[PDB]
């Protein structure tokens with residue numbers, strides 16, 4: 001209803017941060033949560049059950065509301081579903097007060113087949129109820145007729161606020177991601193611009209047009225497409241993914257597209273330097289520089305304290321600027 | 322000297338099937354909501370003729386997900402299993418297309434995008450479709466254009482190659498080629514897998530990065546093709562009977578010619594004929610290789626939206642084969 005641009009601004013006004021918490025649970029995370037809960041008499045699951053919005057998830061709610069002892073004995077074929085969903089609710093419950101947005105990477109929810117997609121749906125439902133801005137990190141790409149299916153999955157079924165998109169095929173795909181002509185609906189996306197992987201230079205920097213490196217050409221074309229679609233007129237936007245370890249490019253992008261929205265993964269697990277990243281990407285409307293932190297929170301044995309410290313650090317750095 | 326079903330690299334599986342059926346037709350299975358709806362409507366009007374034929378087929382008993390539901394009488398689904406109706410008709414539409422057309426297919430390509438928009442239910446269908454194709458021993462491609470950093474992309478590898486047991490998938494390597502180490506190789510199991518990387522695509526604005534960006538007067542698509550091959554060599558794929566190949570759009574004649582000229586023995590997958598109207602003779606000729614399986618021609622909607630998909634598939638098979646013969650007798 002309000003539009004992601006407005007959602008982000010309003011939440012930033014309430015919580016005064018740009019922390020984006022990544023929720024990418026792996027098999028080990030789920031297995032560890034199960035083992036740990038069994039050893040501590042299900043303390044975190046019990047807390048989850050006292051939360052109000054658990055009552056508003058779409059998929060197999062009755063299963064999720066059952067006591068763990070009973071799941072294990074009477075609904076054993078749902079055990080993985082139950083512990084996977086409860087791990088997610090546990091992370092969200094422990095950390096949401098510090099989060100401007102949550103980013104869920106689709107790759108983590110698919111490798112078990114359908115079960116993880118039911119978890120992902122419930123996670124999006126839970127975040128929707130909590131009014132927390134969401135990002136689906138799926139790096140979608142295809143021809144127009146095909147990508148409309150991703151638009152439906154992401155923006156209609158999950159009701160995500162935004163997604164990540166790989167526009168190497170071209171920018172016209174965005175017309176079938178960020179806009180629904182039939183319904184007059186508009187949606188936001190972050191396009192891959194400069195990524196964190198060690199060999200990112202190979203195509204993103206080493207290729208060029210008119211003495212500008214590819215990542216610059218790609219950012220400008222994404223903005224051209226945003227203008228064409230009139231997204232910002234409709235309280236939505238196309239933004240850029242710029243790796244937290246990519247200081248020169250972050251500096252270049254913020255200088256040359258002064259009011260762009262940037263999503264920056266790669267701090268914590270991948271060594272990115274938080275001070276340098278946030279400084280090079282800084283904007284006074286700091287929802288425009290989302291700092292994504294995943295494993296440094298989700299693989300930390302004290303996730304609430306980990307989130308708090310990133311919140312506190314970001315806010316100290318934001319203050320300097 | 323005989324290898325059993327599932328126990329050989331994709332290079333070998335493709336070669337063997339190409340020797341068997343002598344074509345390069347790749348049938349695309351991309352069912353949309355209209356297709357599923359229309360299938361349900363048509364079956365309801367004809368007392369489920371096609372579903373009952375699906376139910377006769379031996380390997381329907383070998384799929385993993387909800388056989389109890391898939392094997393029910395269709396009027397029982399409608400009356401007694403309302404919440405399973407969409408799952409049942411979606412899955413049966415897919416089995417129907419496969420049963421009707423597989424004898425003409427060198428490979429089936431399933432585009433992930435079509436299986437995800439209803440949430441988990443389409444992933445169950447997708448899993449059953451892959452299980453069914455594996456039982457029939459038909460070469461498979463999961464068209465998902467996956468990309469991420471290595472630690473994340475391993476999850477797609479698990480989904481595609483371990484869960485679905487796909488033979489291959491499509492990959493977008495704009496992030497870098499190092500991601501391929503986590504897709505085409507599993508270091509824990511020492512298993513190798515095949516992929517097609519995006520090189521030149523069919524969308525109208527495909528030149529904007531693929532042709533406009535360059536390094537030293539080589540266009541991006543050429544550099545990306547070369548870097549993919551360099552990674553294949555590093556990973557020893559072809560020594561392990563797997564490969565990294567290229568997606569080159571059916572409509573991209575000049576690029577198809579360059580790629581086949583400069584990488585003579587590469588594997589090419591070519592979508593964009595039929596519903597997207599490329600010139601088949603022109604595409605197949607520019608991409609031709611005497612080992613036909615190196616120039617896969619994908620046809621999806623022109624078969625799956627035809628009311629007689631078996632005959633549509635035979636017609637494309639025959640049309641392709643005639644062009645293959647022209648090249649063989651040139």
Ligand SMILES: O=c1[nH]c(=O)c2[nH+]cn([C@@H]3O[C@H](COP(=O)(O)O)[C@@H](O)[C@H]3O)c2[nH]1
Nearest residue numbers: 105195196241243265269293294295470473
């Ligand atoms: O669009 C992207 N461009 C990037 O350069 C990049 N680097 C990491 N990732 C993804 O972000 C998350 C990183 O999470 P960690 O904090 O756990 O490393 C995970 O979800 C990763 O898949 C990227 N996504």
Ligand SMILES: O=c1[nH]c(=O)c2[nH+]cn([C@@H]3O[C@H](COP(=O)(O)O)[C@@H](O)[C@H]3O)c2[nH]1
Nearest residue numbers: 143146432522523568570592596620621622
């Ligand atoms: O990797 C790709 N590069 C391309 O240039 C391209 N063009 C179309 N497609 C996909 O192929 C299928 C087209 O199916 P139709 O015969 O029904 O149009 C569908 O699955 C489309 O998503 C492409 N995939």
